[PDB]
Scaffold this active site. Structure first.
Site, PDB file in Angstrom:
ATOM      1  N   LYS A  13       0.810  -1.216   0.000  1.00 47.20           N
ATOM      2  CA  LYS A  13       0.000   0.000   0.000  1.00 47.20           C
ATOM      3  C   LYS A  13       0.845   1.268   0.000  1.00 47.20           C
ATOM      4  O   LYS A  13       0.390   2.303  -0.500  1.00 47.20           O
ATOM      5  CB  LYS A  13      -0.920  -0.005   1.206  1.00 47.20           C
ATOM      6  CG  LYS A  13      -0.229   0.058   2.558  1.00 47.20           C
ATOM      7  CD  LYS A  13      -1.203  -0.132   3.726  1.00 47.20           C
ATOM      8  CE  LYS A  13      -0.604  -0.735   5.020  1.00 47.20           C
ATOM      9  NZ  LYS A  13       0.694  -0.164   5.512  1.00 47.20           N
ATOM     10  N   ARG A  88      -5.993  -1.516  13.625  1.00 44.06           N
ATOM     11  CA  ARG A  88      -5.831  -2.902  13.247  1.00 44.06           C
ATOM     12  C   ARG A  88      -6.949  -3.798  13.762  1.00 44.06           C
ATOM     13  O   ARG A  88      -7.105  -4.916  13.275  1.00 44.06           O
ATOM     14  CB  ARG A  88      -4.472  -3.415  13.754  1.00 44.06           C
ATOM     15  CG  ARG A  88      -3.312  -2.630  13.168  1.00 44.06           C
ATOM     16  CD  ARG A  88      -1.903  -3.059  13.640  1.00 44.06           C
ATOM     17  NE  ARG A  88      -1.477  -2.331  14.854  1.00 44.06           N
ATOM     18  CZ  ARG A  88      -0.712  -1.238  14.881  1.00 44.06           C
ATOM     19  NH1 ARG A  88      -0.243  -0.675  13.767  1.00 44.06           N
ATOM     20  NH2 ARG A  88      -0.405  -0.685  16.043  1.00 44.06           N
ATOM     21  N   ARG A 123      12.070 -11.850  -3.506  1.00 43.88           N
ATOM     22  CA  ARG A 123      13.010 -10.803  -3.125  1.00 43.88           C
ATOM     23  C   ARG A 123      14.360 -11.401  -2.750  1.00 43.88           C
ATOM     24  O   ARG A 123      14.435 -12.464  -2.127  1.00 43.88           O
ATOM     25  CB  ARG A 123      12.490 -10.011  -1.923  1.00 43.88           C
ATOM     26  CG  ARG A 123      11.460  -8.949  -2.215  1.00 43.88           C
ATOM     27  CD  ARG A 123      11.050  -8.324  -0.897  1.00 43.88           C
ATOM     28  NE  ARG A 123      10.028  -7.296  -1.035  1.00 43.88           N
ATOM     29  CZ  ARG A 123       9.310  -6.824  -0.023  1.00 43.88           C
ATOM     30  NH1 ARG A 123       9.492  -7.301   1.203  1.00 43.88           N
ATOM     31  NH2 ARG A 123       8.400  -5.881  -0.240  1.00 43.88           N
ATOM     32  N   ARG A 156      15.855 -12.934   2.690  1.00 43.99           N
ATOM     33  CA  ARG A 156      15.662 -12.636   4.095  1.00 43.99           C
ATOM     34  C   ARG A 156      14.755 -13.685   4.720  1.00 43.99           C
ATOM     35  O   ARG A 156      13.771 -14.112   4.113  1.00 43.99           O
ATOM     36  CB  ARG A 156      15.053 -11.240   4.232  1.00 43.99           C
ATOM     37  CG  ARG A 156      15.989 -10.120   3.812  1.00 43.99           C
ATOM     38  CD  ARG A 156      15.270  -8.791   3.764  1.00 43.99           C
ATOM     39  NE  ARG A 156      16.211  -7.677   3.759  1.00 43.99           N
ATOM     40  CZ  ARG A 156      15.929  -6.446   3.343  1.00 43.99           C
ATOM     41  NH1 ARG A 156      14.722  -6.146   2.874  1.00 43.99           N
ATOM     42  NH2 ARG A 156      16.867  -5.509   3.392  1.00 43.99           N
ATOM     43  N   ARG A 167       1.607 -15.035   8.271  1.00 47.58           N
ATOM     44  CA  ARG A 167       1.268 -13.642   8.548  1.00 47.58           C
ATOM     45  C   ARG A 167      -0.038 -13.256   7.878  1.00 47.58           C
ATOM     46  O   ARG A 167      -0.848 -12.515   8.462  1.00 47.58           O
ATOM     47  CB  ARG A 167       2.374 -12.702   8.052  1.00 47.58           C
ATOM     48  CG  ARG A 167       3.586 -12.597   8.962  1.00 47.58           C
ATOM     49  CD  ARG A 167       4.377 -11.302   8.715  1.00 47.58           C
ATOM     50  NE  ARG A 167       4.825 -11.114   7.334  1.00 47.58           N
ATOM     51  CZ  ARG A 167       6.047 -11.395   6.883  1.00 47.58           C
ATOM     52  NH1 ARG A 167       6.973 -11.895   7.692  1.00 47.58           N
ATOM     53  NH2 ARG A 167       6.349 -11.172   5.612  1.00 47.58           N
TER      54      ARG A 167
END
Ligand SMILES: Nc1nc2c(ncn2[C@@H]2O[C@H](COP(=O)(O)OP(=O)(O)CP(=O)(O)O)[C@@H](O)[C@H]2O)c(=O)[nH]1
Ligand SMILES: [Mg+2]
Length: 214
Positions: A13, A88, A123, A156, A167
């Site tokens: 976002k 949240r 990534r 990572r 998540r």
């Protein structure tokens, strides 16, 4: 203009934050930035936050809301603000209401889970220098090597697929009621709420935002 921007971890976002800031002349604010700035300032709220954080504890919702209220009273929020990634939970949204903090738009930046997993697992980083790449969407010059140093790029650990998926499961469970809460608030005329297709090219997302925001 007062905007809450919501999105799942990895959806990206933030790719529209500068567009929004420049459109309205408003800062991007966040609970993480507010806490860091308060602790560094030594203010009363900052001292409470520092004592909590220095003990390895989480700041309470009450202190977080007090930091939001203080932040938006600062002169740089005269034209409004872009509140990134908070609330949240419904309890946090209700605490915003109890404190008197309404916004004009709540924007939900949606990207399908499988595309988030793709956006993240591809990534690669060169840890010594913190430069990052992506296999399909932004490949490096030399397959698997930092085009500068030629050392083997790494991934990572936070970007490992199973951590990413967990998540997202947690995020959707937490966020579904909150989305419903804001859609209800919009039905009641207290705010406006809109979903945004964050998979499109950035200019297409921007055009969709312009239609939403007038
Ligand atoms: N690494 C990590 N990030 C988490 C966790 N829980 C929530 N998050 C959120 O997920 C995001 C991970 O960052 P990133 O992979 O860059 O996601 P993004 O969507 O591109 C970042 P933005 O929302 O600013 O555009 C962070 O915004 C972070 O606050 C967690 O347990 N670990
Ligand atoms: Mg962001």
């Amino acid at each position: 203009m007062r905007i809450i921007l919501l999105g799942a971890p990895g959806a990206g976002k933030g790719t529209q934050a500068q567009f929004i800031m420049e459109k309205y002349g408003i800062p991007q604010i966040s609970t993480g930035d507010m806490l860091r700035a308060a602790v560094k300032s030594g203010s009363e709220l900052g001292k409470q936050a520092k004592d909590i954080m220095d003990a390895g504890k989480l700041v309470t919702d009450e202190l977080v809301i007090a930091l939001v209220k203080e932040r938006i009273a600062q002169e740089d929020c005269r034209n409004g603000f872009l509140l990134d990634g908070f609330p949240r939970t419904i309890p946090q949204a209700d605490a915003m209401k109890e404190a008197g903090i309404n916004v004009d738009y709540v924007l939900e930046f949606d990207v399908p889970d499988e595309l988030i997993v793709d956006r993240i697992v591809g990534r690669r980083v060169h840890a010594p220098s913190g430069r990052v790449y992506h296999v399909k969407f932004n490949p490096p010059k030399v397959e698997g090597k930092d085009d500068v140093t030629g050392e083997e790029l790494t991934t990572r650990k936070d970007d490992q697929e199973e951590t990413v998926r967990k998540r997202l499961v947690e995020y959707h469970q937490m966020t579904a009621p909150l989305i419903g809460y804001y859609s209800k608030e919009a039905e009641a005329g207290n705010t406006k709420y809109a979903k945004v297709d964050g998979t499109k090219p950035v200019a297409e997302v921007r055009a969709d935002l312009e239609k939403i925001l007038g």
